[PDB]
Amino acid sequence: IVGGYTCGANTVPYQVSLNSGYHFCGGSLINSQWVVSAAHCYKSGIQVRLGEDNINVVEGNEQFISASKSIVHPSYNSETYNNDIMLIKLKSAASLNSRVASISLPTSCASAGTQCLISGWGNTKSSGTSYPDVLKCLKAPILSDSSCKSASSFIITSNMFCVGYLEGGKDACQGDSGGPVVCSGKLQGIVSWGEGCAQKNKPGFYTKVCNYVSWIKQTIASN
Ligand SMILES: N=C(N)c1cccc(-c2nocc2C(=O)Nc2ccc(-c3ccccc3S(N)(=O)=O)cc2)c1
Ligand SMILES: [Ca+2]
Ligand SMILES: [Cl-]
């Protein structure tokens, strides 16, 4: 997260860290045994880390649970970035508490102009590299489709939306991928891609979760 702030320990209790010997992506807990993340974060042997604040210190409140299934959307396309969503099933159900909590799936798509909360342990620099110990947060608005398209040098699909600030300085970044965008208490986005981070007229792009609610429910029910 570039140009954000320290969330505060466990203030985003649905935020998870995907770990393969180090933190590499975020995710969102949607029930006690399933996490929503990005298809492009797929790796085998993922450990999901719940209840984290400082990802480098055992503070208490952590639950580390291996992924038993990592289900990439069948229509994920790594060139076009369409359908950048993956569902991770936890080997065992997490013990839900105040610091480890699910986030609601949407019943309708979020409204253009709404200010949403993006979070993660990704790079905090727009140029160069600095990774935080503790969870970072950024509030930013959903931009119009027309604005997103005008900003982007890449083809935007109906399964993407953009959120951020066109003046630059405020964005998700590397290592935030797969983590949440929450709008009015609903998980509306997954950190997906952007042209660099926090550059002028290059806002962040996010998987549009409201398009996948039926798919998510069906896939969970059958697995
Ligand atoms: N600024 C962000 N919000 C953000 C979030 C996560 C990662 C990165 C990021 N940090 O460094 C690079 C990045 C990156 O995502 N690059 C990138 C650019 C374009 C595409 C893309 C989008 C749509 C269609 C096609 C493409 S592609 N795959 O042909 O380039 C994909 C990835 C930035
Ligand atoms: Ca920790
Ligand atoms: Cl820090």
Curated annotation (Swiss-Prot):
Q: Name one GO molecular function term.
A: serine-type endopeptidase activity
- State the compartments where it is located: Secreted, Extracellular space
Taxonomically, the superkingdom here is Eukaryota
All copies of domain Peptidase S1, residue ranges: 1-221
Could you state one GO cellular component term attached to this entry?
Answer: extracellular space
- Reported tissue expression: Synthesized in the acinar cells of the pancreas.
Amino acids binding Ca(2+):
E52, N54, V57, E62
Q: Which InterPro entries does this entry report, sorted A to Z?
A: Peptidase_S1_PA (IPR009003), Peptidase_S1_PA_chymotrypsin (IPR043504), Peptidase_S1A (IPR001314), Serine_Proteases_S1 (IPR050127), Trypsin_dom (IPR001254), TRYPSIN_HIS (IPR018114), TRYPSIN_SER (IPR033116)
Which ranges does the record mark as transmembrane?
none
Q: Which cofactor does it need?
A: Ca(2+)
Pfam families, per database record:
Trypsin (PF00089)
Answer yes or no on keyword rRNA-binding.
Answer: no
Q: How is the cofactor bound?
A: Binds 1 Ca(2+) ion per subunit.
**What are the disulphide bonds in this sequence?**
C7-C137, C25-C41, C109-C210, C116-C183, C148-C162, C173-C197
Which PROSITE patterns does UniProt cross-reference here? TRYPSIN_DOM, TRYPSIN_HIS, TRYPSIN_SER
Q: Which residues bind substrate?
A: D171, A172, Q174, G175, S177
Q: What is its EC number?
A: 3.4.21.4
What protein family does this chain belong to? Belongs to the peptidase S1 family.
PANTHER family, sorted: RIKEN CDNA 2210010C04 GENE, TRYPSIN-RELATED
* Annotated protein name in UniProt: Serine protease 1
